[PDB]
Amino acid sequence: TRLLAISPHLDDAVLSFGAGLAQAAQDGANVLVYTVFAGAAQPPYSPAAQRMHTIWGLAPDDDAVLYRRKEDIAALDHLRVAHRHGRFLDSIYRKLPDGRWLTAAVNDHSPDSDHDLVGEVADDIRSIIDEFDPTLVVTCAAIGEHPDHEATRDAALFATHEKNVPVRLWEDLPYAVFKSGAVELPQGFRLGSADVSSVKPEMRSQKFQAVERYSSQMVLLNGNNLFDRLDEHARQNAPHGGYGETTWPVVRSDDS
Numbered sequence: 620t621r622l623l624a625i626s627p628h629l630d631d632a633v634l635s636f637g638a639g640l641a642q643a644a645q646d647g648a649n650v651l652v653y654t655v656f657a658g659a660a661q662p663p664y665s666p667a668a669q670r671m672h673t674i675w676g677l678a679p680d681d682d683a684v685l686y687r688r689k690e691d692i693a694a695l696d697h698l699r700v701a702h703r704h705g706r707f708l709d710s711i712y713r714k715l716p717d718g719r720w721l722t723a724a725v726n727d728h729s730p731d732s733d734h735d736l737v738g739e740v741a742d743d744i745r746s747i748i749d750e751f752d753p754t755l756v757v758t759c760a761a762i763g764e765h766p767d768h769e770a771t772r773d774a775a776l777f778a779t780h781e782k783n784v785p786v787r788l789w790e791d792l793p794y795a796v797f798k799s800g801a802v803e804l805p806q807g808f809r810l811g812s813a814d815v816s817s818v819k820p821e822m823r824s825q826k827f828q829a830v831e832r833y834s835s836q837m838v839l840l841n842g843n844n845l846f847d848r849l850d851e852h853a854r855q856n857a858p859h860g861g862y863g864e865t866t867w868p869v870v871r872s873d874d875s
């Protein structure tokens with residue numbers, strides 16, 4: 620088995636699918652987690668980016684991407700899976716064609732810009748598929764509607780469809796604790812029946828320990844009960860006990 624996980628940001632795959640990644644590695648699968656929006660960023664930073672850097676426990680003008688890449692490597696090494704850091708800039712570092720920052724909340728902009736980004740991400744994913752030759756791709760459902768998650772999900776769907784590789788979407792955590800869960804896929808795609816995994820306690824522990832490697836995100840993610848909320852979420856999906864993660868297969872719609 621060759622499992623390619625496609626994470627929007629540096630932490631999403633571990634937060635949402637860390638137990639599944641860890642189990643896959645345990646079972647002897649070759650597992651690679653490619654993070655789309657891991658692109659190097661340098662000052663000048665927007666005021667919004669400077670504020671986020673502060674929330675992440677960094678100086679406003681620090682190399683936040685460098686810090687997060689190192690966190691990601693530690694977390695993924697802890698799960699014993701490989702990493703690959705993509706070239707795309709996180710939403711807080713992107714500019715619009717007219718020179719404005721993308722984020723301020725997202726500034727009004729042309730769908731053309733969204734399409735162009737999705738196209739480039741899709742190009743990179745098609746190349747990674749050629750290079751890694753995955754038997755399964757898993758990426759985010761984009762529950763919560765973060766534009767980077769939506770771009771990642773849509774690009775992965777288009778790339779996998781063209782390359783004829785099976786794809787599944789994970790339930791975005793911790794977002795799904797606060798959202799309804801319904802998502803709007805690009806035309807022609809739909810979700811099949813959910814799978815709710817049940818993993819051994821060791822895999823829960825491995826996942827939670829890996830999450831902790833993302834120290835910069837802990838204040839943001841905890842709001843001080845992140846792990847309790849993750850446990851409660853799994854409990855609600857599997858009342859008989861045991862930790863797990865929800866994923867859906869993505870298939871072609873009828874008449875498409």
Ligand SMILES: CCCCCCCCO[C@@H]1O[C@H](CO)[C@@H](O)[C@H](O)[C@H]1O
Binds near residue numbers: 629
């Ligand atoms: C960014 C668009 C507005 C909606 C707010 C959603 C909550 C923010 O979410 C975050 O945003 C960042 C910047 O993209 C990231 O670097 C993070 O990993 C992430 O958790």
Ligand SMILES: [Zn+2]
Binds near residue numbers: 765
């Ligand atoms: Zn994210």
